[PDB]
């Protein structure tokens, strides 16, 4: 009754707070906590840190920490424990390069038990927001380091948070229980079991049969036709949040034929997005015309949408010398046929469905899209090295969008950097991204974001598809299920069946 059963496609992993795969972010967030906490309105609030001051030049920050916090094993949380955690993370700095704060921190030291000083290389504006992320800046008991480090593994995953990992049974389940010695508000739920169920249909069936009480995830959570059916069945409860992030294609500006602006523009008129959403996504998501929705901070720029218009797509291609040979449906220019490879994870049935629609839509305007469905590692490797023509991609949701997503466009080993490599203005874009992150002149900040997002839009780097929502399926006795402000987190501690 105060225990619930739910599911996840894989086990939660070791729960090393400072590493990535195979750690599941939502679970790191259940056990480990930030100095300051992200809120829906976009601010952060005091959390493990009660308060903070900063120097006039914005580069030195001093946090006053709470003095009543214990790790779940009884050991104290204090400035020394915090400082040791920052050291452990930064001893592995190279792996955090995607996150600009990790390049910004020049020093962290405990000034006393309750005072923590962080020194930055520049007045990095998103400082607090990045401290608030699920990883890597959260705190494990230093006693649980291995040889004074965490980058080579941890002992027990001892955090300060409201949940404690009880046991993990590989490929079967993970059990968490409530921290009875939590510094903050006590969760009403005392135990959460995560059944390992990798297949979306099997998750749907597990819920139907009563095996599980709750499903909480993005558009991939369960089949969307089944989701629609569940929402009409009074025996169940379902929810669909307001949109959290964008799903789009990235187009390779550095590889023929997507290296041509005219081709990228034509592709952006070719897809009937509303129909795609109604056909493949059962009408559960929203059409996206821009990289970021207009509701995203800094992103309400009045950018012009490219509406579904096959006639205009064709005219663009013809004008660019992509014409149809006699007897053929696929355009050619300088001998070369208009062929584009679309990469996606092959076992992902939803990605595959959208890919087929996109392929069909583009064929109607004379573009031959070849589907390349591959395993994750192969797709990720393609993203890193630019071996794609078009690839499925998505933004990261709050609090990453837009600043952290944009920041990462500068990093060579990522899809967006690769996709943008063919732009003459790529260096300028990357310089402006660097500038905007350290800008405290609010006017200049908005102008830089406008210029960056406008160039990306006008250069047709992306083919935005939809703004997607979080969805929930639950037994009615659990009541309304809240959403966590951070899109990768799951607010189990706010679930209150009574």
Curated annotation (Swiss-Prot):
Alphabetical list of InterPro entries matching this protein: CntA-like, Peptide/Ni-bd, SBP_5, SBP_5_CS, SBP_5_dom
Subcellular location: Periplasm
Pfam families assigned: SBP_bac_5
An example Gene Ontology CC term for this record: ATP-binding cassette (ABC) transporter complex, substrate-binding subunit-containing
One Gene Ontology molecular-function label: transition metal ion binding
UniProtKB keywords: Nickel, Periplasm, Signal, Transport
Keyword check for Electron transport: no
GO terms under biological process: negative chemotaxis; nickel cation import across plasma membrane; nickel cation transport; peptide transport
Principal subcellular localisation of the protein: periplasm
SUPFAM superfamilies found in the cross-reference section: Periplasmic binding protein-like II
Function: Involved in a nickel transport system, probably represents the nickel binder.
Membership in a protein family: Belongs to the bacterial solute-binding protein 5 family.
Name the UniProt record assigns to this protein: Nickel-binding periplasmic protein
